[PDB]
């Protein structure tokens, strides 16, 4: 019986006095318990075009923007007019009171659970500054919580803004009267944070999310709702008809919150309107913005006096560019936030044949019709009246020379089905290209959106444009030499090597990072939209992103409309009620990486079992167990991170690219052991010691002898038998006590000569391992320094310090050594770090961090590299691909090569 009453109207009308029978939304209670929200001069309109819900009854008190917001938020809701989908219209007392009760009772018919306990708990809890965090103990004391909180929010008990692009999900506003008085008392109109602070970290963030206090600079807040109600005297550098371009936007009324929204949109993009980054001059009068880069490049967006919106730009190249980008941004803003004007909106293009005569206007649709069969207006080119219809504002190097195009559009020339078009195989300028054709009932808006994406962003991981036209309305971009990723996943499963699919993932992550850095949300990532140019893993370009027909500007305000293919979209996008940030793209990339790791897998199952693919996406199986793929540790972890319900828990695209940009990720191949099971030695199925295990001082695989050291059959205690602790063959050598010894006793190299260099304690220590190579690498107990000696001279050659490398990049004390045939040295420090040194140049290739807490024993098997470590107790067994140093070098070189391309494509 909890009904919501919202008395909306124009200030003064005496609607507050109407109920009794100015500083923000009020609230009262009436007995059928009625929750009344009494709304309130005109500054609050852009502050609360939000608090309408759906389960409420409206009482309008001839303002039409109010009705426009009502019919756009709560479509099915009674609206009773009172004098001083309309259901009744009364005039002014008690007779209308019965109508309200009758309408409220009929509204429930025209339009229970464990709620009532959480409702009471949230209502009966008083705190100062009432908003509270995720206080789960209040429900613990007394998969269904976000389904009850939503109902309570839609009932007036509290407000929970769970929209991803608000960052207010964690905190819960109690007794929502307070949030309608502290958020609406901040309001010539350029006040600073210092003054606000004298009346707060989340408070400033909360204000800007509601279009109340925009950030125009440090310690500065724009506060659009408080700007002057009249424009100053602007005298533009050009006043002749032939020198300016004018376009009007005629509306029945300005939507509630339209101008603050437009100002926010325009001031965020102004640095990048010419280049795509120099700041212009800006002015504000609450119904317009003046941008000014020069007397030749400016932009005046205002509102003449119904409800027209004028855009004035100079009639030059930079003026046309600014006009095009302002029109595109206004159209995008209207599509995102004001659906209902798209017809309630009329667009006029102003033109004149001779200078000095009155301006006459033509409807933009008629002008587009005339431009579809010509580029001149017959009683004065169209490029001077509406340059954006013929793409005259875009760069001239991407204009379609229709005489150089050999395009068939045959069913056998099809390449794929785009978002709103169809890509075909064609030839342009004597080259193999791909042409996208929009299907019959499309407008210039889709072309212009995909051109916004394709024209100003150049990245080695984004599809490149070659030409664009309007008469056939195509997009010639380029031909991917190897097709889409879906075809590779479902047909050519054999060519997908590990190092190739890692590059495929990395190139898509890099493209997403760049797309997000330019305030663009892709909104649909799938193997179909990922294009492959080569299957050679060492190439710089392996994967690109195409089909930008669903991409849209995603500024700090977010995006509301829902786009994306079922099964490749974030969970917050499937339920098209919240407004989401660019983390949906991160979730889509997580799904795509899951697909890459599992190859066909869930895609093959979804083409077999539809309408369950999208339902399973809120939990999906383990990649390894479900489809039997080879384990890819630290990539399954990234998949789990990217496949999280909370968008804020998900990493950003830059973080995903950073995680993927590591050779530890690709060369890792990690097996944990039971808790409190310590391992001393292992041999290669793998045999382990402790008690002899399988998956005691020494072991050996004799083609299993169990013991200080043992080789497949020499035994060392320090009495050797065909304290001694070292023996290796590469000739066979060894080490006894604190001196190196050899035999084919052949060469007793007593090693206390090195006491002069380094500490004597490190010099005179028991030997741990000896390595046989052109040189002699020796490390001792608790020795952060590895000694290098020459067999030919039986003399020291030089000492290397692991502590030096560790500090340059941490126990540092050497525990084990292993030599790789590619001239790389593996050293296991006392901590959980691994050092890769080139044997020749003595240079640090890379240090392995976050691996473990301590390294015990290290060896190689078959070709992989076995490292055993502790976690001080828990011991872990880790398998590293033995191509790790070369992979580090190749990955860093590849990153540099394709990074010097991103700064050259611009
Ligand atoms: C196998 C065959 C298939 N092929 C392609 C090419 C493409 C392609 N190229 N360029 C494009 C630009 C855009 C584009 O928009 C998509 C993603 C909407 C389909 C596709 C392509 N997409 C699939 N297959 C190229 C030939 C050589 O190989
Ligand atoms: N005498 C009289 N005063 C009215 C009438 N309607 C409105 N008012 C005046 O309008 C004021 C109410 O303003 P109100 O509409 O509640 O402001 P709002 O809540 O911010 O929209 C009261 O002070 C009344 O004096 C009316 O029919 N008769
Ligand atoms: Mg009032």
Residue numbers in the entry: 1333 to 1353, 1368 to 1377, 1388 to 1396, 1398 to 1418, 1430 to 1452, 1481 to 1488, 1497 to 1515, 1528 to 1558, ...
Question: What do the paper's sentences say?
Answer:
We chose the I2020T mutation because of the different properties exhibited by G2019S and I2020T despite affecting neighboring residues. Although the three structures—WT, G2019S, and I2020T—were very similar, two features were unique to LRRK2RCKW(G2019S):MLi-2. The second was an unexplained density we observed in the LRRK2RCKW(WT):MLi-2 and LRRK2RCKW(I2020T):MLi-2 cryo-EM maps, but not in that of LRRK2RCKW(G2019S):MLi-2. This additional density in WT and I2020T could accommodate an alternative rotamer for H1998, which closes the binding site around MLi-2. The cryo-EM maps of WT and I2020T showed density that could be accounted for by two different rotamers of H1998, while G2019S could only accommodate one. One of the rotamers in WT and I2020T, the one absent in G2019S, contributed to a larger MLi-2–binding interface that closed around the inhibitor. Next, we compared the kinase domains to see whether this difference in global conformation reflected differences in the states of the kinases themselves between LRRK2 and LRRK2RCKW. This was the case for MLi-2: While our structure of LRRK2RCKW(I2020T):MLi-2 showed an active-like, DYG “in”, αC “in” conformation with an ordered activation loop, the kinase in LRRK2(I2020T):MLi-2 had its αC in an “out” conformation and a disordered activation loop. As expected, the type I inhibitor MLi-2 led to a more closed kinase conformation in LRRK2 than the type II GZD-824 (left); the ROC domain in the MLi-2 structure is shifted toward the kinase by 3.4 Å as measured by the distance between the M1335 residues. This difference increased to 5.8 Å in LRRK2RCKW, where the N-terminal repeats are absent (right).
Mutations in leucine-rich repeat kinase 2 (LRRK2) are one of the most common drivers of the familial form of Parkinson’s disease (PD) (1–3) and are also associated with increased risk for the sporadic form of PD. LRRK2 is a large, 2527-residue multidomain protein. Its N-terminal half is composed of armadillo (ARM), ankyrin (ANK), and leucine-rich (LRR) repeat domains, while its C-terminal half contains two catalytic domains, a guanosine triphosphatase (GTPase) (Ras of complex or ROC) and a Ser/Thr kinase, as well as two architectural domains, a C-terminal of ROC (COR) between the GTPase and the kinase and a WD40 domain at the end. We present cryo-EM structures of LRRK2RCKW, WT, and carrying the PD-linked mutations G2019S and I2020T, bound to the LRRK2-specific type I inhibitor MLi-2 or the broad-spectrum type II inhibitor GZD-824.
